[PDB]
Amino acid sequence: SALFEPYTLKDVTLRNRIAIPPMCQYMAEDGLINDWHQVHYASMARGGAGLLVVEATAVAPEGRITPGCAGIWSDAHAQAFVPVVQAIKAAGSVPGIQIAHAGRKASANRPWEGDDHIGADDARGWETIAPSAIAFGAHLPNVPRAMTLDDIARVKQDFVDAARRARDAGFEWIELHFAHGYLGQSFFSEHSNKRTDAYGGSFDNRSRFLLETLAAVREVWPENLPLTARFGVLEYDGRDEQTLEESIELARRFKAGGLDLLSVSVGFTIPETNIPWGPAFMGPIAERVRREAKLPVTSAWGFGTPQLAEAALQANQLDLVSVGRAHLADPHWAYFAAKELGVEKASWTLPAPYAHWLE
Amino acid sequence: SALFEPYTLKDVTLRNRIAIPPMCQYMAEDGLINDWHQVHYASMARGGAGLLVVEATAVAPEGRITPGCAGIWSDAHAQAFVPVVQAIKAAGSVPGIQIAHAGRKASANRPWEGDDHIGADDARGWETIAPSAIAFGAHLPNVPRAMTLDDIARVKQDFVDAARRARDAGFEWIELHFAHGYLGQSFFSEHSNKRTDAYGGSFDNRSRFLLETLAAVREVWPENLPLTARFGVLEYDGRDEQTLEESIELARRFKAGGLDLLSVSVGFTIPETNIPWGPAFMGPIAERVRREAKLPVTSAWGFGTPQLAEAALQANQLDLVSVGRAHLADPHWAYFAAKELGVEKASWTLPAPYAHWLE
Ligand SMILES: Cc1cc2nc3c(=O)[nH]c(=O)nc-3n(C[C@H](O)[C@H](O)[C@H](O)COP(=O)(O)O)c2cc1C
Ligand SMILES: Cc1cc2nc3c(=O)[nH]c(=O)nc-3n(C[C@H](O)[C@H](O)[C@H](O)COP(=O)(O)O)c2cc1C
Ligand SMILES: CCOC(=O)/C(=N\O)C(C)=O
Ligand SMILES: CCOC(=O)/C(=N\O)C(C)=O
Ligand SMILES: [Cl-]
């Protein structure tokens, strides 16, 4: 089974090709994770996945999506992650973390509490920042404040500080969240970046925030640990051909800037899109990025069955398969995939107190 | 769905009829549970089961099965369970514990480390006790020491002390382990009880240790919390008709002694048996116990498919369906059952951070 071949990137070895992608839990308070996350991540790591990327973790308070999002903007926040890192490691999985800034999509309600921007009368909300003072729209109508040059310098430092905190907490894998219409993605997209200074206008200027943030993180992130990013390479906004070509060129510059692997996703920068949802629909897009940027990739959004995950590898589209919702439904999904794929001693994807009885 | 009707017993209400039966994890050290159990139990409780009965927990060190078994023979041991109790309650499940004494099956290796008796001279092994100085045989050759009347008094008091500690840790449900060939079961079975004093020989005498332990525990266990027991009602030794009839009579005396529910199982007292290798063979047996002893019952051994569990409840065979190994494979099995049975808002069998996305 290709899905259960180990994978080595820099000096880190994943025991299989199953990655749990970042998945916000909305259960933190003031950015501080707690027993919800401890059990959530430990249980999934024991389920057998080779890599567990902890949810989008805010580099700054206003970079949270919701009042329930995790943060790593202080050392106490980072210390809260230590037992999570150690629990993922004890299960034999590799602990990773996605550090993020929600940009204009910040200051929103939890998904089951409206999923929409928090109103100005609500005391829980806050002012959002973004490259330009233009709203996402739809259920996220709050217009963000346009960032100053000092904002840009401060946020980049927040990414540096968060990467250093993630490193010191013991994460062996970091993912910069440059996707899904949050801050980084919105600097790259002309839909949301209306700037005329050095951070908007041209391709170089729109790339500048992401390339500089990557460069600043690379200076503090160890060379022997994978430095990755999630990036939306197309929007399904009717401009996919040119957007994908620009996104792949940026991925080439990420590679030259020391990025080890690209988590290929959709931009979600604006609501006015037509995303063709279907099983493994990102397959050919991830493969094109993989081949044209010559960079290892993972992807998500419909690979969450054993056969689809395996086929994505057999087809040389992905190096790692990210399986998200299936792991919320079944924290031991990796074990389920091992069985479904007829892996030898499949039950031993799990720790002995389970494996012995399921063989 | 009958499986997702709530169930009320004394002052406890289970949100559904799915019980997680006790399942030894063999991960404790000197009886002390740890982060293995914390995540294991909290994750399963979040999976949606209405009742989680924590594994066989030894009332005394020599009553462990293995060096990895949990114990509750001191207040420090009981304190270790408090976070487990509270995590199970926080997920909306009801915390239970099975208190146990392995009898002549004690001092054995973990199942995946040989599963056989450890010699008492071995630093990890110890001397076993039983109603009669007769070995189980096969891979459990250690001959136990026949218990004196003072031994009987000591062990019953250990059950009492353990029930008090379980109450103080916050357990809302207790199960006496009188099954599976351990101490209590072996007092009841003529195969293992060769005593001629007041605790062997007749039906009354063989029943005495179990009835006296129940009575002693009944004194300290709160009237408003279910007092339950697990008992092997037949052995598949060719004496099943006479054995089951005596077992149903003991269930009647259990009820008269204040037992609230009986977990019906197999004896496993000796190895020379022909136990059915198949699912749900206990259904009609448990139904007979339920109807002839007029006592609520649960059972296990192969009910871990949603349709089988639903069928056992529709047939009035069980009041609760115990689903064990399926929860080792999938801690969210209760959610999987909700889906398969077409329960409305099935995803909300799970907490919101999962439920919202699985709709
Ligand atoms: C509850 C939930 C939270 C998510 N949070 C994040 C996140 O914090 N960062 C991110 O990059 N993607 C996030 N995603 C997107 C997932 O990482 C993944 O791409 C998505 O679930 C699709 O993959 P799947 O079909 O296997 O579920 C989230 C998805 C879900 C369902
Ligand atoms: C790993 C494991 C540990 C078990 N430990 C106990 C136990 O401690 N006490 C008990 O009464 N039964 C124990 N059993 C028996 C189970 O509680 C249950 O009766 C058995 O798994 C049959 O149910 P199932 O078919 O749903 O798995 C254990 C079973 C397993 C698989
Ligand atoms: C619309 C896609 O955005 C995401 O997946 C996300 N984070 O990146 C969430 C849901 O928190
Ligand atoms: C074979 C029947 O015995 C059991 O089920 C058991 N405990 O009761 C264990 C720890 O396996
Ligand atoms: Cl000890």
Residue numbers in the entry:
A (entry chain B), B (entry chain D): 2 to 360
Quote the paper:
In general, XenA structures showed a better-defined electron density for the substrate when prepared by soaking, while for OPR3, clearer results were obtained by co-crystallization. The propanoyl moiety of oxime 1b points into this cavity and is likely stabilized by hydrophobic interactions. Substrates with an acetyl moiety (such as oximes 1a and 1c) give the non-productive binding mode described above. Comparable experimental pKa values are reported for chemically similar oximes and for the 8-hydroxycoumarin and para-hydroxybenzaldehyde. Substrates of ene-reductases usually bind with the hydride-receiving atom within van der Waals distance from the N5 of the flavin and with an enzyme-dependent angle between the flavin N10–N5 axis and the atom receiving the hydride. In the cases mentioned above, none of these criteria are satisfied, and the binding modes very likely correspond to catalytically non-active complexes. Thus, we will refer to it as the “non-productive binding mode”. The calculated high Kd for oxime 1b clearly indicates this enzyme’s low affinity for the substrate and might explain why this enzyme performed poorly in the biotransformation of the other oximes in our previous work.
